[PDB]
Enzyme design. Structure first.
Site, PDB file in Angstrom:
ATOM      1  N   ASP A 126       1.223  -1.410   0.087  1.00 46.33           N
ATOM      2  CA  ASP A 126      -0.345  -0.024   0.228  1.00 46.33           C
ATOM      3  C   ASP A 126       0.841   1.251   0.037  1.00 46.33           C
ATOM      4  O   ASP A 126       0.793   1.803   1.015  1.00 46.33           O
ATOM      5  CB  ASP A 126      -1.140  -0.102   1.470  1.00 46.33           C
ATOM      6  CG  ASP A 126      -1.885   1.126   0.701  1.00 46.33           C
ATOM      7  OD1 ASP A 126      -2.256   1.700   0.162  1.00 46.33           O
ATOM      8  OD2 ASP A 126      -2.532   1.462   2.078  1.00 46.33           O
ATOM      9  N   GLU A 127       1.613   1.297  -0.954  1.00 45.87           N
ATOM     10  CA  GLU A 127       2.897   2.394  -1.020  1.00 45.87           C
ATOM     11  C   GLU A 127       2.524   3.721  -1.740  1.00 45.87           C
ATOM     12  O   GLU A 127       2.239   4.895  -1.435  1.00 45.87           O
ATOM     13  CB  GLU A 127       3.459   2.068  -1.635  1.00 45.87           C
ATOM     14  CG  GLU A 127       5.572   2.410  -0.099  1.00 45.87           C
ATOM     15  CD  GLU A 127       6.591   1.808  -0.476  1.00 45.87           C
ATOM     16  OE1 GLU A 127       6.823   1.337  -1.450  1.00 45.87           O
ATOM     17  OE2 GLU A 127       7.354   3.324  -0.748  1.00 45.87           O
TER      18      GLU A 127
END
Lengths: 265, 265
Positions: A126-127
Protein backbone atom coordinates in the site's frame (compact mmCIF):
# COMPACT_ATOMS: atom_id res chain seq x y z
CA UNK A 1 19.99 -25.32 3.42
CA UNK A 2 19.00 -24.14 6.90
CA UNK A 3 18.29 -20.53 7.68
CA UNK A 4 15.87 -17.65 7.09
CA UNK A 5 13.63 -17.56 4.03
CA UNK A 6 15.16 -15.03 1.65
CA UNK A 7 12.94 -13.01 -0.71
CA UNK A 8 13.83 -11.27 -3.97
CA UNK A 9 11.74 -8.52 -5.58
CA UNK A 10 12.20 -8.17 -9.32
CA UNK A 11 11.02 -5.11 -11.20
CA UNK A 12 9.71 -6.77 -14.32
CA UNK A 13 9.56 -3.50 -16.23
CA UNK A 14 13.34 -3.79 -16.45
CA UNK A 15 14.56 -7.27 -15.55
CA UNK A 16 13.88 -10.96 -15.95
CA UNK A 17 12.40 -13.08 -13.20
CA UNK A 18 14.91 -15.76 -14.28
CA UNK A 19 17.87 -14.06 -12.60
CA UNK A 20 16.49 -15.14 -9.23
CA UNK A 21 17.37 -18.67 -10.26
CA UNK A 22 21.01 -18.05 -11.21
CA UNK A 23 22.21 -17.80 -7.64
CA UNK A 24 22.92 -20.96 -5.69
CA UNK A 25 24.85 -21.69 -2.48
CA UNK A 26 28.48 -22.60 -3.10
CA UNK A 27 28.33 -25.19 -0.32
CA UNK A 28 24.72 -26.34 -0.09
CA UNK A 29 23.92 -26.00 -3.78
CA UNK A 30 20.48 -24.91 -2.64
CA UNK A 31 18.82 -21.75 -3.89
CA UNK A 32 20.16 -18.44 -2.62
CA UNK A 33 16.57 -17.15 -2.87
CA UNK A 34 13.40 -18.86 -1.68
CA UNK A 35 10.67 -16.48 -2.82
CA UNK A 36 10.59 -14.31 -5.93
CA UNK A 37 8.06 -11.50 -6.26
CA UNK A 38 6.83 -10.02 -9.55
CA UNK A 39 6.87 -6.29 -8.95
CA UNK A 40 4.19 -5.25 -9.68
CA UNK A 41 0.51 -5.32 -10.75
CA UNK A 42 -1.72 -2.31 -9.97
CA UNK A 43 -5.08 -1.52 -8.50
CA UNK A 44 -6.56 0.97 -10.94
CA UNK A 45 -9.66 3.12 -10.48
CA UNK A 46 -12.41 3.54 -13.01
CA UNK A 47 -13.78 7.03 -12.43
CA UNK A 48 -16.74 6.39 -14.70
CA UNK A 49 -18.21 3.64 -12.50
CA UNK A 50 -16.18 4.49 -9.37
CA UNK A 51 -14.80 0.96 -9.12
CA UNK A 52 -11.31 -0.39 -8.58
CA UNK A 53 -9.95 -3.03 -10.90
CA UNK A 54 -6.75 -5.04 -11.22
CA UNK A 55 -4.39 -3.92 -13.92
CA UNK A 56 -1.26 -5.48 -15.41
CA UNK A 57 1.01 -3.25 -17.45
CA UNK A 58 2.29 -4.87 -20.67
CA UNK A 59 5.48 -6.00 -18.88
CA UNK A 60 3.65 -7.77 -16.05
CA UNK A 61 1.19 -9.22 -18.58
CA UNK A 62 4.09 -10.36 -20.74
CA UNK A 63 5.68 -12.39 -17.91
CA UNK A 64 2.29 -13.87 -16.86
CA UNK A 65 1.52 -14.93 -20.42
CA UNK A 66 4.94 -16.56 -20.54
CA UNK A 67 4.65 -18.38 -17.24
CA UNK A 68 5.95 -21.54 -18.91
CA UNK A 69 9.22 -19.81 -19.56
CA UNK A 70 9.36 -16.94 -17.05
CA UNK A 71 7.86 -18.53 -13.97
CA UNK A 72 7.74 -22.32 -14.24
CA UNK A 73 11.50 -22.78 -14.17
CA UNK A 74 11.64 -20.89 -10.88
CA UNK A 75 8.91 -22.98 -9.33
CA UNK A 76 10.40 -26.24 -10.48
CA UNK A 77 13.69 -25.17 -8.88
CA UNK A 78 11.82 -24.69 -5.59
CA UNK A 79 11.31 -20.94 -5.63
CA UNK A 80 7.82 -19.66 -4.76
CA UNK A 81 6.50 -16.87 -6.99
CA UNK A 82 4.18 -14.13 -5.74
CA UNK A 83 2.57 -11.24 -7.57
CA UNK A 84 2.86 -7.89 -5.76
CA UNK A 85 0.05 -5.33 -6.03
CA UNK A 86 0.24 -1.62 -5.42
CA UNK A 87 -2.09 1.30 -5.63
CA UNK A 88 -1.18 3.84 -8.28
CA UNK A 89 -1.74 7.59 -7.86
CA UNK A 90 -5.30 7.03 -9.09
CA UNK A 91 -6.79 7.16 -5.63
CA UNK A 92 -7.78 3.54 -5.07
CA UNK A 93 -5.87 1.78 -2.28
CA UNK A 94 -6.35 -1.33 -0.17
CA UNK A 95 -7.72 0.74 2.70
CA UNK A 96 -10.55 2.51 0.90
CA UNK A 97 -12.90 -0.06 -0.62
CA UNK A 98 -16.46 1.19 0.11
CA UNK A 99 -17.86 -2.16 1.31
CA UNK A 100 -17.31 -5.83 1.87
CA UNK A 101 -18.68 -6.38 -1.59
CA UNK A 102 -16.31 -3.92 -3.24
CA UNK A 103 -13.44 -5.42 -1.24
CA UNK A 104 -14.55 -8.98 -2.00
CA UNK A 105 -14.88 -8.49 -5.77
CA UNK A 106 -11.28 -7.29 -6.03
CA UNK A 107 -10.17 -10.20 -3.81
CA UNK A 108 -11.81 -12.47 -6.38
CA UNK A 109 -9.83 -10.71 -9.11
CA UNK A 110 -6.56 -11.44 -7.33
CA UNK A 111 -7.43 -15.12 -6.78
CA UNK A 112 -8.49 -15.68 -10.37
CA UNK A 113 -5.08 -14.40 -11.51
CA UNK A 114 -3.12 -16.51 -9.07
CA UNK A 115 -5.16 -19.55 -10.12
CA UNK A 116 -4.93 -18.69 -13.81
CA UNK A 117 -1.18 -18.12 -13.85
CA UNK A 118 -0.34 -20.67 -11.19
CA UNK A 119 1.31 -18.17 -8.88
CA UNK A 120 2.02 -19.06 -5.25
CA UNK A 121 0.50 -15.99 -3.69
CA UNK A 122 -0.14 -12.26 -3.44
CA UNK A 123 1.89 -9.51 -1.76
CA UNK A 124 0.32 -6.17 -0.73
CA UNK A 125 2.16 -2.89 -1.03
CA UNK A 126 0.00 0.00 0.00
CA UNK A 127 2.62 2.48 -1.00
CA UNK A 128 1.52 5.04 -3.55
CA UNK A 129 -2.28 4.73 -3.55
CA UNK A 130 -2.85 8.50 -2.95
CA UNK A 131 -6.19 8.25 -1.19
CA UNK A 132 -8.57 11.05 -2.12
CA UNK A 133 -7.21 11.47 -5.66
CA UNK A 134 -9.96 11.58 -8.34
CA UNK A 135 -12.69 11.78 -5.75
CA UNK A 136 -11.82 8.58 -3.91
CA UNK A 137 -12.44 8.28 -0.17
CA UNK A 138 -9.83 8.40 2.59
CA UNK A 139 -8.96 5.12 4.31
CA UNK A 140 -11.59 3.49 6.51
CA UNK A 141 -11.27 0.76 9.15
CA UNK A 142 -12.88 -2.18 7.40
CA UNK A 143 -11.67 -2.11 3.82
CA UNK A 144 -8.47 -4.04 4.38
CA UNK A 145 -10.04 -6.49 6.84
CA UNK A 146 -12.78 -7.28 4.29
CA UNK A 147 -10.21 -7.58 1.53
CA UNK A 148 -7.84 -9.95 3.30
CA UNK A 149 -10.63 -12.06 4.84
CA UNK A 150 -12.13 -12.54 1.39
CA UNK A 151 -8.76 -13.27 -0.16
CA UNK A 152 -7.68 -15.78 2.46
CA UNK A 153 -10.98 -17.68 1.92
CA UNK A 154 -10.74 -17.77 -1.89
CA UNK A 155 -7.24 -19.21 -1.63
CA UNK A 156 -6.72 -20.85 1.75
CA UNK A 157 -3.54 -22.57 0.58
CA UNK A 158 -1.52 -19.74 -0.97
CA UNK A 159 0.81 -17.12 0.43
CA UNK A 160 -0.47 -13.65 1.32
CA UNK A 161 2.17 -11.14 2.43
CA UNK A 162 2.45 -7.43 2.94
CA UNK A 163 5.00 -4.67 3.12
CA UNK A 164 4.66 -3.01 6.50
CA UNK A 165 3.73 0.39 5.08
CA UNK A 166 0.79 2.67 4.33
CA UNK A 167 -2.75 3.07 5.75
CA UNK A 168 -3.77 -0.52 5.15
CA UNK A 169 -0.85 -1.85 7.23
CA UNK A 170 -2.28 -0.34 10.40
CA UNK A 171 -5.88 -1.33 9.80
CA UNK A 172 -5.61 -5.03 10.58
CA UNK A 173 -8.61 -5.30 12.90
CA UNK A 174 -12.18 -4.28 12.33
CA UNK A 175 -14.87 -4.76 14.95
CA UNK A 176 -13.87 -8.02 16.61
CA UNK A 177 -11.81 -9.45 13.75
CA UNK A 178 -8.05 -9.19 13.40
CA UNK A 179 -6.52 -10.42 10.14
CA UNK A 180 -2.88 -10.50 11.31
CA UNK A 181 -2.97 -14.27 11.57
CA UNK A 182 -4.25 -14.46 7.98
CA UNK A 183 -0.87 -13.30 6.63
CA UNK A 184 2.14 -15.55 6.09
CA UNK A 185 4.83 -12.86 6.00
CA UNK A 186 5.37 -9.18 6.73
CA UNK A 187 8.47 -7.19 5.86
CA UNK A 188 10.18 -3.93 6.62
CA UNK A 189 9.74 -1.72 3.59
CA UNK A 190 12.69 0.58 4.40
CA UNK A 191 15.79 -0.55 2.49
CA UNK A 192 19.09 -0.52 4.23
CA UNK A 193 17.43 -0.38 7.67
CA UNK A 194 16.36 -2.65 10.50
CA UNK A 195 12.75 -2.20 11.59
CA UNK A 196 10.64 -4.92 13.19
CA UNK A 197 7.15 -4.92 11.68
CA UNK A 198 4.60 -4.07 14.35
CA UNK A 199 2.22 -6.83 13.19
CA UNK A 200 1.41 -9.84 15.38
CA UNK A 201 3.20 -12.61 13.47
CA UNK A 202 5.82 -14.91 14.97
CA UNK A 203 9.47 -13.98 14.40
CA UNK A 204 9.77 -16.82 11.92
CA UNK A 205 7.34 -14.96 9.66
CA UNK A 206 8.84 -11.52 9.95
CA UNK A 207 11.56 -9.62 8.12
CA UNK A 208 12.89 -6.62 10.08
CA UNK A 209 15.77 -6.33 7.58
CA UNK A 210 15.25 -4.96 4.06
CA UNK A 211 17.96 -4.30 1.45
CA UNK A 212 18.20 -3.22 -2.15
CA UNK A 213 20.64 -5.44 -4.01
CA UNK A 214 23.32 -3.30 -5.65
CA UNK A 215 22.36 -0.14 -3.74
CA UNK A 216 22.60 -0.87 -0.01
CA UNK A 217 26.23 -1.30 1.01
CA UNK A 218 27.53 -4.86 1.21
CA UNK A 219 28.69 -4.23 4.79
CA UNK A 220 25.17 -3.13 5.66
CA UNK A 221 23.77 -6.10 3.75
CA UNK A 222 25.98 -8.43 5.81
CA UNK A 223 25.24 -6.70 9.16
CA UNK A 224 21.45 -6.90 8.65
CA UNK A 225 21.63 -10.58 7.64
CA UNK A 226 23.70 -11.35 10.73
CA UNK A 227 21.30 -9.42 12.88
CA UNK A 228 18.37 -11.42 11.42
CA UNK A 229 20.05 -14.64 12.56
CA UNK A 230 21.20 -13.27 15.96
CA UNK A 231 17.70 -12.12 16.87
CA UNK A 232 16.02 -15.26 15.53
CA UNK A 233 13.92 -13.89 12.66
CA UNK A 234 13.06 -16.22 9.86
CA UNK A 235 12.78 -13.98 6.76
CA UNK A 236 15.26 -11.70 4.94
CA UNK A 237 13.82 -9.32 2.31
CA UNK A 238 15.87 -8.34 -0.66
CA UNK A 239 14.89 -5.92 -3.40
CA UNK A 240 15.65 -5.29 -7.05
CA UNK A 241 17.94 -8.08 -8.24
CA UNK A 242 18.79 -7.20 -11.83
CA UNK A 243 20.68 -9.04 -14.59
CA UNK A 244 24.19 -7.92 -13.71
CA UNK A 245 26.75 -9.91 -11.76
CA UNK A 246 25.48 -9.39 -8.21
CA UNK A 247 27.41 -12.36 -6.72
CA UNK A 248 29.27 -10.30 -4.13
CA UNK A 249 26.06 -8.61 -2.98
CA UNK A 250 24.30 -11.91 -2.75
CA UNK A 251 27.23 -13.61 -0.98
CA UNK A 252 27.28 -10.74 1.52
CA UNK A 253 24.01 -12.11 2.95
CA UNK A 254 24.26 -15.87 2.20
CA UNK A 255 27.47 -16.09 4.24
CA UNK A 256 25.53 -14.76 7.23
CA UNK A 257 22.20 -16.52 6.69
CA UNK A 258 23.53 -19.91 5.56
CA UNK A 259 27.28 -19.86 6.19
CA UNK A 260 27.97 -20.13 2.47
CA UNK A 261 28.99 -17.79 -0.31
CA UNK A 262 26.93 -17.75 -3.51
CA UNK A 263 27.64 -18.61 -7.09
CA UNK A 264 26.13 -17.29 -10.33
CA UNK A 265 25.70 -19.45 -13.41
CA UNK B 1 -4.46 31.99 -27.45
CA UNK B 2 -5.31 33.69 -24.15
CA UNK B 3 -5.68 31.76 -20.94
CA UNK B 4 -3.82 29.75 -18.30
CA UNK B 5 -0.53 28.03 -19.09
CA UNK B 6 -1.31 24.34 -19.46
CA UNK B 7 1.29 21.70 -18.55
CA UNK B 8 1.60 18.09 -19.71
CA UNK B 9 3.64 15.43 -17.91
CA UNK B 10 4.80 12.57 -20.10
CA UNK B 11 6.08 9.33 -18.65
CA UNK B 12 8.90 8.65 -21.06
CA UNK B 13 9.27 5.05 -19.93
CA UNK B 14 6.07 4.42 -21.89
CA UNK B 15 5.25 7.28 -24.23
CA UNK B 16 6.69 9.78 -26.67
CA UNK B 17 7.20 13.42 -25.82
CA UNK B 18 5.94 14.14 -29.35
CA UNK B 19 2.29 13.52 -28.49
CA UNK B 20 2.24 16.82 -26.61
CA UNK B 21 2.56 18.48 -29.99
CA UNK B 22 -0.35 16.74 -31.72
CA UNK B 23 -3.01 18.75 -29.94
CA UNK B 24 -3.90 22.20 -31.21
CA UNK B 25 -6.85 24.53 -30.63
CA UNK B 26 -9.63 24.10 -33.19
CA UNK B 27 -10.22 27.85 -33.21
CA UNK B 28 -6.93 29.49 -32.28
CA UNK B 29 -4.69 26.90 -33.91
CA UNK B 30 -2.34 27.52 -31.00
CA UNK B 31 -0.91 24.72 -28.89
CA UNK B 32 -3.25 22.97 -26.49
CA UNK B 33 -0.21 22.54 -24.21
CA UNK B 34 2.38 25.15 -23.28
CA UNK B 35 4.85 23.18 -21.16
CA UNK B 36 5.87 19.54 -21.52
CA UNK B 37 7.73 17.77 -18.73
CA UNK B 38 9.98 14.72 -19.16
CA UNK B 39 8.99 12.45 -16.30
CA UNK B 40 11.49 11.71 -14.87
CA UNK B 41 15.20 11.70 -13.96
CA UNK B 42 16.28 10.49 -10.50
CA UNK B 43 18.47 11.54 -7.63
CA UNK B 44 20.38 8.38 -6.76
CA UNK B 45 22.52 7.72 -3.70
CA UNK B 46 25.96 6.22 -3.73
CA UNK B 47 26.29 4.37 -0.43
CA UNK B 48 30.00 3.83 -0.94
CA UNK B 49 30.85 7.56 -0.85
CA UNK B 50 27.54 8.69 0.72
CA UNK B 51 26.85 11.12 -2.11
CA UNK B 52 23.80 11.82 -4.21
CA UNK B 53 24.08 11.89 -7.97
CA UNK B 54 21.77 12.52 -10.91
CA UNK B 55 20.65 9.47 -12.78
CA UNK B 56 18.82 9.00 -16.09
CA UNK B 57 17.29 5.61 -16.78
CA UNK B 58 17.85 4.36 -20.35
CA UNK B 59 14.47 5.79 -21.42
CA UNK B 60 15.18 9.30 -20.14
CA UNK B 61 18.71 9.08 -21.57
CA UNK B 62 17.29 7.91 -24.88
CA UNK B 63 15.04 10.98 -25.25
CA UNK B 64 17.85 13.36 -24.16
CA UNK B 65 20.26 11.86 -26.66
CA UNK B 66 17.60 12.31 -29.32
CA UNK B 67 16.76 15.90 -28.45
CA UNK B 68 16.92 16.79 -32.15
CA UNK B 69 13.99 14.51 -32.79
CA UNK B 70 12.25 14.13 -29.40
CA UNK B 71 12.53 17.62 -27.99
CA UNK B 72 13.45 20.18 -30.66
CA UNK B 73 10.19 19.86 -32.56
CA UNK B 74 8.30 20.70 -29.38
CA UNK B 75 10.41 23.74 -28.68
CA UNK B 76 10.19 25.03 -32.21
CA UNK B 77 6.41 24.74 -31.96
CA UNK B 78 6.54 26.96 -28.87
CA UNK B 79 6.32 24.35 -26.13
CA UNK B 80 8.79 24.66 -23.24
CA UNK B 81 10.41 21.40 -22.12
CA UNK B 82 11.41 20.72 -18.51
CA UNK B 83 13.10 17.71 -16.96
CA UNK B 84 11.44 16.48 -13.73
CA UNK B 85 13.57 14.99 -10.95
CA UNK B 86 12.46 12.71 -8.16
CA UNK B 87 14.07 10.91 -5.31
CA UNK B 88 13.95 7.14 -5.57
CA UNK B 89 13.57 4.85 -2.55
CA UNK B 90 17.35 5.07 -2.12
CA UNK B 91 17.14 7.59 0.69
CA UNK B 92 18.44 10.73 -0.99
CA UNK B 93 15.87 13.52 -1.35
CA UNK B 94 15.94 17.26 -1.98
CA UNK B 95 15.53 17.97 1.72
CA UNK B 96 18.48 16.01 3.07
CA UNK B 97 21.69 17.24 1.45
CA UNK B 98 24.28 17.50 4.27
CA UNK B 99 25.61 20.96 3.33
CA UNK B 100 25.56 23.86 0.95
CA UNK B 101 28.37 22.17 -0.89
CA UNK B 102 26.54 18.86 -1.25
CA UNK B 103 23.42 20.76 -2.30
CA UNK B 104 25.38 23.00 -4.68
CA UNK B 105 27.21 20.15 -6.46
CA UNK B 106 23.93 18.46 -7.37
CA UNK B 107 22.52 21.84 -8.49
CA UNK B 108 25.49 22.02 -10.84
CA UNK B 109 24.61 18.56 -12.14
CA UNK B 110 21.08 19.69 -12.99
CA UNK B 111 22.29 22.84 -14.77
CA UNK B 112 24.88 21.02 -16.84
CA UNK B 113 22.13 18.70 -18.13
CA UNK B 114 19.73 21.50 -18.94
CA UNK B 115 22.54 23.34 -20.74
CA UNK B 116 23.78 20.19 -22.46
CA UNK B 117 20.39 19.06 -23.73
CA UNK B 118 18.96 22.53 -24.23
CA UNK B 119 16.05 22.00 -21.87
CA UNK B 120 14.01 24.96 -20.61
CA UNK B 121 14.11 24.10 -16.95
CA UNK B 122 13.88 21.72 -14.01
CA UNK B 123 10.87 20.52 -12.02
CA UNK B 124 11.19 19.11 -8.48
CA UNK B 125 9.10 16.23 -7.24
CA UNK B 126 10.02 15.26 -3.73
CA UNK B 127 7.69 12.33 -3.79
CA UNK B 128 9.29 8.98 -3.10
CA UNK B 129 12.71 9.90 -1.67
CA UNK B 130 12.27 7.72 1.48
CA UNK B 131 14.49 9.70 3.81
CA UNK B 132 16.48 7.50 6.18
CA UNK B 133 16.74 4.56 3.75
CA UNK B 134 20.30 3.18 3.42
CA UNK B 135 21.55 5.29 6.29
CA UNK B 136 20.58 8.65 4.85
CA UNK B 137 19.55 11.51 7.15
CA UNK B 138 16.04 12.80 7.75
CA UNK B 139 15.13 16.16 6.18
CA UNK B 140 16.80 19.28 7.53
CA UNK B 141 15.87 22.96 7.13
CA UNK B 142 18.58 24.17 4.79
CA UNK B 143 19.05 21.48 2.18
CA UNK B 144 16.34 22.65 -0.18
CA UNK B 145 17.11 26.36 0.32
CA UNK B 146 20.78 25.70 -0.55
CA UNK B 147 19.76 23.58 -3.52
CA UNK B 148 17.34 26.03 -5.09
CA UNK B 149 19.52 29.09 -4.38
CA UNK B 150 22.42 27.38 -6.12
CA UNK B 151 20.25 26.23 -8.99
CA UNK B 152 18.63 29.60 -9.60
CA UNK B 153 22.13 31.20 -9.77
CA UNK B 154 23.57 28.64 -12.20
CA UNK B 155 20.64 29.21 -14.54
CA UNK B 156 19.01 32.57 -13.86
CA UNK B 157 17.03 32.42 -17.10
CA UNK B 158 15.40 28.99 -16.99
CA UNK B 159 12.26 27.64 -15.39
CA UNK B 160 12.37 25.99 -11.96
CA UNK B 161 9.10 24.46 -10.75
CA UNK B 162 7.95 22.11 -8.06
CA UNK B 163 5.12 19.79 -7.19
CA UNK B 164 3.65 20.95 -3.91
CA UNK B 165 4.46 17.73 -2.05
CA UNK B 166 6.97 16.13 0.31
CA UNK B 167 9.40 17.45 2.96
CA UNK B 168 11.21 19.80 0.62
CA UNK B 169 7.98 21.62 -0.30
CA UNK B 170 7.59 22.94 3.23
CA UNK B 171 11.21 23.91 3.77
CA UNK B 172 11.32 27.03 1.61
CA UNK B 173 13.00 29.33 4.12
CA UNK B 174 16.22 28.88 6.01
CA UNK B 175 17.54 31.48 8.42
CA UNK B 176 16.54 34.74 6.78
CA UNK B 177 16.23 33.46 3.21
CA UNK B 178 13.00 32.35 1.55
CA UNK B 179 13.29 30.74 -1.89
CA UNK B 180 9.59 30.92 -2.83
CA UNK B 181 10.25 33.81 -5.18
CA UNK B 182 12.96 31.76 -6.89
CA UNK B 183 10.35 29.39 -8.38
CA UNK B 184 8.35 30.09 -11.53
CA UNK B 185 5.52 27.61 -10.93
CA UNK B 186 4.06 25.38 -8.24
CA UNK B 187 1.33 22.80 -8.76
CA UNK B 188 -1.11 20.67 -6.84
CA UNK B 189 0.19 17.12 -6.97
CA UNK B 190 -3.19 15.49 -6.22
CA UNK B 191 -4.89 14.44 -9.46
CA UNK B 192 -8.56 14.99 -9.83
CA UNK B 193 -8.61 17.52 -6.96
CA UNK B 194 -8.48 21.25 -6.34
CA UNK B 195 -5.85 22.32 -3.83
CA UNK B 196 -4.18 25.73 -3.79
CA UNK B 197 -0.44 25.36 -3.18
CA UNK B 198 0.49 27.02 0.09
CA UNK B 199 3.60 28.64 -1.43
CA UNK B 200 3.92 32.42 -1.81
CA UNK B 201 3.68 32.78 -5.60
CA UNK B 202 1.14 34.96 -7.39
CA UNK B 203 -2.01 33.24 -8.68
CA UNK B 204 -0.68 33.53 -12.21
CA UNK B 205 2.10 31.13 -11.25
CA UNK B 206 0.02 28.59 -9.41
CA UNK B 207 -1.93 25.50 -10.40
CA UNK B 208 -4.50 24.43 -7.77
CA UNK B 209 -6.02 22.01 -10.31
CA UNK B 210 -4.28 18.75 -11.27
CA UNK B 211 -5.66 16.02 -13.55
CA UNK B 212 -4.51 12.77 -15.07
CA UNK B 213 -5.46 12.66 -18.74
CA UNK B 214 -7.50 9.53 -19.44
CA UNK B 215 -8.06 8.74 -15.75
CA UNK B 216 -9.76 11.73 -14.12
CA UNK B 217 -13.33 12.06 -15.37
CA UNK B 218 -13.91 14.50 -18.22
CA UNK B 219 -16.59 16.26 -16.16
CA UNK B 220 -14.07 16.71 -13.37
CA UNK B 221 -11.46 17.79 -15.92
CA UNK B 222 -13.87 20.45 -17.21
CA UNK B 223 -15.00 21.61 -13.72
CA UNK B 224 -11.39 22.10 -12.52
CA UNK B 225 -10.43 24.01 -15.68
CA UNK B 226 -13.46 26.27 -15.26
CA UNK B 227 -12.62 26.78 -11.63
CA UNK B 228 -9.04 27.77 -12.58
CA UNK B 229 -10.43 30.52 -14.81
CA UNK B 230 -13.17 31.63 -12.35
CA UNK B 231 -10.68 32.07 -9.51
CA UNK B 232 -8.05 33.71 -11.71
CA UNK B 233 -5.20 31.18 -11.59
CA UNK B 234 -2.80 31.12 -14.46
CA UNK B 235 -1.62 27.47 -14.67
CA UNK B 236 -3.44 24.16 -15.30
CA UNK B 237 -1.46 20.95 -14.64
CA UNK B 238 -2.17 17.86 -16.64
CA UNK B 239 -0.56 14.46 -16.21
CA UNK B 240 0.24 11.41 -18.29
CA UNK B 241 -0.76 12.18 -21.88
CA UNK B 242 -0.11 8.98 -23.80
CA UNK B 243 -0.25 8.07 -27.51
CA UNK B 244 -3.93 7.22 -27.75
CA UNK B 245 -6.67 9.50 -29.04
CA UNK B 246 -7.18 11.76 -26.01
CA UNK B 247 -8.98 14.53 -27.97
CA UNK B 248 -12.13 14.47 -25.84
CA UNK B 249 -10.11 14.62 -22.62
CA UNK B 250 -8.04 17.46 -23.94
CA UNK B 251 -11.09 19.33 -25.31
CA UNK B 252 -12.74 18.96 -21.90
CA UNK B 253 -10.22 21.50 -20.55
CA UNK B 254 -9.43 23.64 -23.65
CA UNK B 255 -13.11 24.59 -23.97
CA UNK B 256 -12.93 26.01 -20.44
CA UNK B 257 -9.44 27.51 -20.51
CA UNK B 258 -9.50 28.92 -24.05
CA UNK B 259 -13.09 28.63 -25.27
CA UNK B 260 -12.04 26.18 -27.97
CA UNK B 261 -12.16 22.45 -28.49
CA UNK B 262 -8.97 20.64 -29.48
CA UNK B 263 -7.89 18.70 -32.51
CA UNK B 264 -5.40 15.85 -32.89
CA UNK B 265 -3.28 15.39 -36.01
Amino acid sequence: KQGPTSVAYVEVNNNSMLNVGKYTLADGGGNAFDVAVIFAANINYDTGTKTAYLHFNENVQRVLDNAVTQIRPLQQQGIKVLLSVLGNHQGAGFANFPSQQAASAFAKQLSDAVAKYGLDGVDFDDEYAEYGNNGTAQPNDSSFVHLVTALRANMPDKIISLYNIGPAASRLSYGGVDVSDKFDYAWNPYYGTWQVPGIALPKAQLSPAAVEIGRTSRSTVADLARRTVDEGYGVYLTYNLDGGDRTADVSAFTRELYGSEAVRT
